[PDB]
mmCIF file of C-alpha atoms in Angstrom:
data_model
loop_
_atom_site.group_PDB
_atom_site.id
_atom_site.type_symbol
_atom_site.label_atom_id
_atom_site.label_comp_id
_atom_site.label_asym_id
_atom_site.label_seq_id
_atom_site.Cartn_x
_atom_site.Cartn_y
_atom_site.Cartn_z
ATOM 1 C CA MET A 1 -0.056 -0.034 -0.044
ATOM 2 C CA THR A 2 0.990 3.729 -0.404
ATOM 3 C CA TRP A 3 -0.340 7.093 0.549
ATOM 4 C CA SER A 4 0.461 10.814 1.361
ATOM 5 C CA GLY A 5 -1.295 10.767 4.757
ATOM 6 C CA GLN A 6 1.866 11.148 7.000
ATOM 7 C CA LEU A 7 1.848 12.941 10.342
ATOM 8 C CA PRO A 8 4.657 15.714 10.596
ATOM 9 C CA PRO A 9 7.923 13.845 11.200
ATOM 10 C CA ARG A 10 9.585 17.090 12.315
ATOM 11 C CA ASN A 11 7.023 17.997 15.158
ATOM 12 C CA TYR A 12 7.958 15.315 17.951
ATOM 13 C CA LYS A 13 7.667 16.148 21.604
ATOM 14 C CA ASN A 14 11.305 15.968 22.403
ATOM 15 C CA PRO A 15 10.858 14.406 25.963
ATOM 16 C CA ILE A 16 14.438 13.108 26.891
ATOM 17 C CA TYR A 17 17.506 11.608 25.243
ATOM 18 C CA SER A 18 18.660 7.957 25.332
ATOM 19 C CA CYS A 19 21.525 7.545 22.785
ATOM 20 C CA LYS A 20 24.488 9.260 21.273
ATOM 21 C CA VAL A 21 24.507 12.378 19.188
ATOM 22 C CA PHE A 22 25.772 13.186 15.692
ATOM 23 C CA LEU A 23 27.913 16.193 15.052
ATOM 24 C CA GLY A 24 29.532 17.860 12.092
ATOM 25 C CA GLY A 25 30.896 21.307 10.767
ATOM 26 C CA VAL A 26 34.550 21.096 11.815
ATOM 27 C CA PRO A 27 36.523 20.935 8.565
ATOM 28 C CA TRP A 28 39.743 21.952 10.442
ATOM 29 C CA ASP A 29 39.707 20.622 13.988
ATOM 30 C CA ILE A 30 43.057 18.716 14.499
ATOM 31 C CA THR A 31 41.954 16.926 17.667
ATOM 32 C CA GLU A 32 38.484 15.972 18.917
ATOM 33 C CA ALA A 33 39.624 16.189 22.473
ATOM 34 C CA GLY A 34 39.745 19.934 21.955
ATOM 35 C CA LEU A 35 35.884 19.909 21.492
ATOM 36 C CA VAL A 36 35.735 17.589 24.596
ATOM 37 C CA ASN A 37 37.656 20.270 26.792
ATOM 38 C CA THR A 38 35.189 22.849 25.429
ATOM 39 C CA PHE A 39 32.103 20.875 26.231
ATOM 40 C CA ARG A 40 33.218 19.001 29.316
ATOM 41 C CA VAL A 41 32.830 22.451 31.004
ATOM 42 C CA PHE A 42 29.230 21.394 31.806
ATOM 43 C CA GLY A 43 30.059 17.853 33.189
ATOM 44 C CA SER A 44 31.007 14.328 32.566
ATOM 45 C CA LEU A 45 31.848 13.950 28.822
ATOM 46 C CA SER A 46 33.657 11.481 26.328
ATOM 47 C CA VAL A 47 34.283 11.234 22.599
ATOM 48 C CA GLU A 48 34.290 8.614 19.850
ATOM 49 C CA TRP A 49 35.884 8.632 16.305
ATOM 50 C CA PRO A 50 36.982 5.652 14.191
ATOM 51 C CA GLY A 51 40.587 4.956 14.248
ATOM 52 C CA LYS A 52 41.713 6.041 17.724
ATOM 53 C CA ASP A 53 44.022 2.935 17.405
ATOM 54 C CA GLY A 54 45.706 4.315 14.258
ATOM 55 C CA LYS A 55 49.291 5.955 13.962
ATOM 56 C CA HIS A 56 48.170 9.239 15.743
ATOM 57 C CA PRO A 57 44.933 10.681 17.278
ATOM 58 C CA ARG A 58 45.197 13.564 14.538
ATOM 59 C CA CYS A 59 43.341 11.280 12.073
ATOM 60 C CA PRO A 60 39.687 11.806 12.864
ATOM 61 C CA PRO A 61 37.292 12.295 9.739
ATOM 62 C CA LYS A 62 37.482 14.955 7.140
ATOM 63 C CA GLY A 63 34.787 17.020 9.129
ATOM 64 C CA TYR A 64 32.832 14.758 11.467
ATOM 65 C CA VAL A 65 32.757 13.311 14.882
ATOM 66 C CA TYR A 66 30.382 11.602 17.336
ATOM 67 C CA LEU A 67 29.808 12.212 21.044
ATOM 68 C CA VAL A 68 28.958 9.915 23.863
ATOM 69 C CA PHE A 69 28.505 11.062 27.571
ATOM 70 C CA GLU A 70 25.918 11.566 30.367
ATOM 71 C CA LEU A 71 22.634 10.315 28.815
ATOM 72 C CA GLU A 72 20.287 13.131 29.843
ATOM 73 C CA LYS A 73 21.592 16.294 31.800
ATOM 74 C CA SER A 74 24.707 16.998 29.713
ATOM 75 C CA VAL A 75 22.641 16.458 26.410
ATOM 76 C CA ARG A 76 20.023 19.057 27.346
ATOM 77 C CA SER A 77 22.511 21.501 28.808
ATOM 78 C CA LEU A 78 24.524 21.611 25.394
ATOM 79 C CA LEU A 79 21.471 22.204 23.273
ATOM 80 C CA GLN A 80 19.941 24.814 25.699
ATOM 81 C CA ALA A 81 23.147 26.630 26.112
ATOM 82 C CA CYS A 82 23.958 26.990 22.391
ATOM 83 C CA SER A 83 21.846 27.965 19.245
ATOM 84 C CA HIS A 84 18.599 26.367 18.229
ATOM 85 C CA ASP A 85 15.988 26.964 15.510
ATOM 86 C CA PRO A 86 12.714 25.335 15.131
ATOM 87 C CA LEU A 87 11.166 24.964 11.558
ATOM 88 C CA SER A 88 12.922 28.227 10.206
ATOM 89 C CA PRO A 89 15.395 26.044 8.323
ATOM 90 C CA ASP A 90 12.158 25.366 6.166
ATOM 91 C CA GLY A 91 12.697 21.473 6.116
ATOM 92 C CA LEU A 92 13.975 19.986 9.619
ATOM 93 C CA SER A 93 14.780 20.952 13.035
ATOM 94 C CA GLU A 94 18.476 21.792 13.809
ATOM 95 C CA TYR A 95 20.924 22.784 16.718
ATOM 96 C CA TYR A 96 24.213 24.837 16.219
ATOM 97 C CA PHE A 97 27.073 25.925 18.423
ATOM 98 C CA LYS A 98 30.450 27.449 17.857
ATOM 99 C CA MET A 99 33.964 26.609 19.548
ATOM 100 C CA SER A 100 36.129 28.825 17.495
ATOM 101 C CA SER A 101 38.148 31.749 18.985
ATOM 102 C CA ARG A 102 39.804 33.481 15.801
ATOM 103 C CA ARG A 103 42.695 31.123 16.430
ATOM 104 C CA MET A 104 42.955 30.165 12.686
ATOM 105 C CA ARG A 105 39.291 29.983 11.356
ATOM 106 C CA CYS A 106 35.670 30.512 12.563
ATOM 107 C CA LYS A 107 32.526 28.450 11.648
ATOM 108 C CA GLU A 108 29.595 26.889 13.491
ATOM 109 C CA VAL A 109 28.921 23.265 14.066
ATOM 110 C CA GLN A 110 25.458 21.578 13.769
ATOM 111 C CA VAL A 111 24.011 19.021 16.138
ATOM 112 C CA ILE A 112 21.412 16.154 16.046
ATOM 113 C CA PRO A 113 20.956 14.086 19.214
ATOM 114 C CA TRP A 114 19.100 10.844 19.714
ATOM 115 C CA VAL A 115 15.851 11.394 21.306
ATOM 116 C CA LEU A 116 13.548 8.855 23.232
ATOM 117 C CA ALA A 117 11.015 9.722 20.399
ATOM 118 C CA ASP A 118 13.278 7.806 18.016
ATOM 119 C CA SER A 119 13.428 4.720 20.174
ATOM 120 C CA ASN A 120 9.824 3.835 20.741
ATOM 121 C CA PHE A 121 6.210 5.026 21.110
ATOM 122 C CA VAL A 122 3.021 3.780 22.588
ATOM 123 C CA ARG A 123 -0.738 3.958 21.813
ATOM 124 C CA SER A 124 -1.333 3.141 25.371
ATOM 125 C CA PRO A 125 1.147 3.774 28.163
ATOM 126 C CA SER A 126 -1.117 1.555 30.505
ATOM 127 C CA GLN A 127 -0.515 -1.701 28.502
ATOM 128 C CA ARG A 128 2.567 -3.893 28.063
ATOM 129 C CA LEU A 129 4.543 -6.064 25.593
ATOM 130 C CA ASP A 130 2.411 -9.131 24.732
ATOM 131 C CA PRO A 131 3.694 -12.757 24.972
ATOM 132 C CA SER A 132 5.386 -13.244 21.557
ATOM 133 C CA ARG A 133 3.047 -11.135 19.537
ATOM 134 C CA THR A 134 5.457 -8.948 17.702
ATOM 135 C CA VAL A 135 6.864 -8.907 14.269
ATOM 136 C CA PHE A 136 10.171 -7.548 12.855
ATOM 137 C CA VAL A 137 10.676 -4.190 11.092
ATOM 138 C CA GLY A 138 13.622 -3.207 8.923
ATOM 139 C CA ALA A 139 14.629 -1.194 5.828
ATOM 140 C CA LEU A 140 12.778 1.807 7.178
ATOM 141 C CA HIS A 141 13.875 5.534 7.037
ATOM 142 C CA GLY A 142 17.092 6.315 8.562
ATOM 143 C CA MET A 143 15.315 7.901 11.581
ATOM 144 C CA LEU A 144 11.663 6.795 11.103
ATOM 145 C CA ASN A 145 10.672 8.568 14.444
ATOM 146 C CA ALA A 146 7.520 8.117 16.591
ATOM 147 C CA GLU A 147 5.465 10.462 14.395
ATOM 148 C CA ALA A 148 6.059 8.321 11.277
ATOM 149 C CA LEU A 149 5.982 5.015 13.045
ATOM 150 C CA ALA A 150 2.639 6.013 14.629
ATOM 151 C CA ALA A 151 1.369 7.099 11.164
ATOM 152 C CA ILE A 152 2.051 3.876 9.310
ATOM 153 C CA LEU A 153 1.091 1.444 11.997
ATOM 154 C CA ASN A 154 -2.310 3.120 12.853
ATOM 155 C CA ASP A 155 -3.190 3.525 9.113
ATOM 156 C CA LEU A 156 -2.611 -0.103 8.220
ATOM 157 C CA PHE A 157 -4.921 -1.481 10.979
ATOM 158 C CA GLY A 158 -5.512 0.979 13.825
ATOM 159 C CA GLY A 159 -4.963 -2.168 16.227
ATOM 160 C CA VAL A 160 -1.746 -1.274 18.033
ATOM 161 C CA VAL A 161 -0.502 -1.054 21.490
ATOM 162 C CA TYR A 162 3.380 -0.471 21.424
ATOM 163 C CA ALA A 163 6.106 -0.080 18.819
ATOM 164 C CA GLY A 164 9.754 0.667 18.703
ATOM 165 C CA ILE A 165 13.108 0.328 17.329
ATOM 166 C CA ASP A 166 16.078 -1.538 18.831
ATOM 167 C CA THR A 167 19.363 0.019 20.017
ATOM 168 C CA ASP A 168 22.782 -1.373 21.104
ATOM 169 C CA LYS A 169 25.382 0.540 23.222
ATOM 170 C CA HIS A 170 26.156 3.551 21.048
ATOM 171 C CA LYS A 171 26.087 1.861 17.654
ATOM 172 C CA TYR A 172 22.980 4.207 16.539
ATOM 173 C CA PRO A 173 21.471 1.721 14.261
ATOM 174 C CA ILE A 174 17.908 3.322 13.927
ATOM 175 C CA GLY A 175 17.314 0.751 11.331
ATOM 176 C CA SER A 176 16.100 -2.575 12.928
ATOM 177 C CA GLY A 177 13.078 -3.008 15.212
ATOM 178 C CA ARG A 178 9.891 -4.829 16.321
ATOM 179 C CA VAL A 179 6.199 -3.758 16.871
ATOM 180 C CA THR A 180 3.711 -5.245 19.335
ATOM 181 C CA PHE A 181 0.174 -5.744 19.099
ATOM 182 C CA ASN A 182 -3.032 -6.692 21.058
ATOM 183 C CA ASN A 183 -4.995 -7.729 18.182
ATOM 184 C CA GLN A 184 -4.555 -10.406 15.456
ATOM 185 C CA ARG A 185 -5.658 -8.021 12.573
ATOM 186 C CA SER A 186 -2.258 -6.407 12.593
ATOM 187 C CA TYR A 187 -0.357 -9.774 12.392
ATOM 188 C CA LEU A 188 -1.746 -11.324 9.188
ATOM 189 C CA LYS A 189 -2.181 -7.798 7.445
ATOM 190 C CA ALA A 190 1.383 -6.607 8.246
ATOM 191 C CA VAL A 191 2.739 -9.831 6.827
ATOM 192 C CA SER A 192 0.330 -9.723 3.854
ATOM 193 C CA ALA A 193 1.379 -6.182 3.203
ATOM 194 C CA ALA A 194 5.260 -6.716 3.839
ATOM 195 C CA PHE A 195 6.199 -3.178 2.576
ATOM 196 C CA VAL A 196 4.374 0.128 2.176
ATOM 197 C CA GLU A 197 5.418 3.500 0.457
ATOM 198 C CA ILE A 198 5.140 7.151 1.598
ATOM 199 C CA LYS A 199 4.673 9.401 -1.273
ATOM 200 C CA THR A 200 4.425 12.955 0.155
ATOM 201 C CA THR A 201 5.551 16.078 -1.838
ATOM 202 C CA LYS A 202 9.124 16.312 -0.397
ATOM 203 C CA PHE A 203 9.383 13.222 1.776
ATOM 204 C CA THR A 204 9.204 9.674 0.416
ATOM 205 C CA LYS A 205 10.166 6.455 2.448
ATOM 206 C CA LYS A 206 9.357 2.827 2.742
ATOM 207 C CA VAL A 207 9.116 0.307 5.666
ATOM 208 C CA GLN A 208 9.405 -3.369 5.602
ATOM 209 C CA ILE A 209 8.073 -6.174 7.737
ATOM 210 C CA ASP A 210 8.742 -9.926 8.419
ATOM 211 C CA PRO A 211 6.964 -12.759 10.338
ATOM 212 C CA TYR A 212 7.986 -13.882 13.748
#
């Protein structure tokens, strides 16, 4: 099946944070521990980039880095002590900050952290995960947040109780999950549909499903 009926995938509730944050905008930063010594001013912080076991730590990506630290307080602190804009970018939400000091160049960096609204959603918080009544989800959008996951799963059958995407320790998969139901209508219809398409004007995606 296919439609254009999506719910705004850019108007989520931003409750709290639960996984790492993606960062980029530093095409000249020689050492990522510099960014750590400018951000750890607010608390416990750490950093990760591929290749810290290489020939020197001055070999981080051409302009990218990832951050991992205190799951909640430091996360909201950075985002709420720097610059933010809602939907004025005219396409998505974004955060920005600036750690330059006319030492050689000056440019701002752009942040997008992992929110609990990217990990799961419920149609009823007063319910639970039912005994072995859940099917696998994959090949979905590289975010497929709780607004898009709630839109596709209520449109297909309206019989839902819980849905989410699986995470591991700081691997930021956002691409493999499961969905739980309290009705049978969702089990044989999700398996018979196996794939549906989003055909909006400036946003198009698909989500796949497999039996349990």
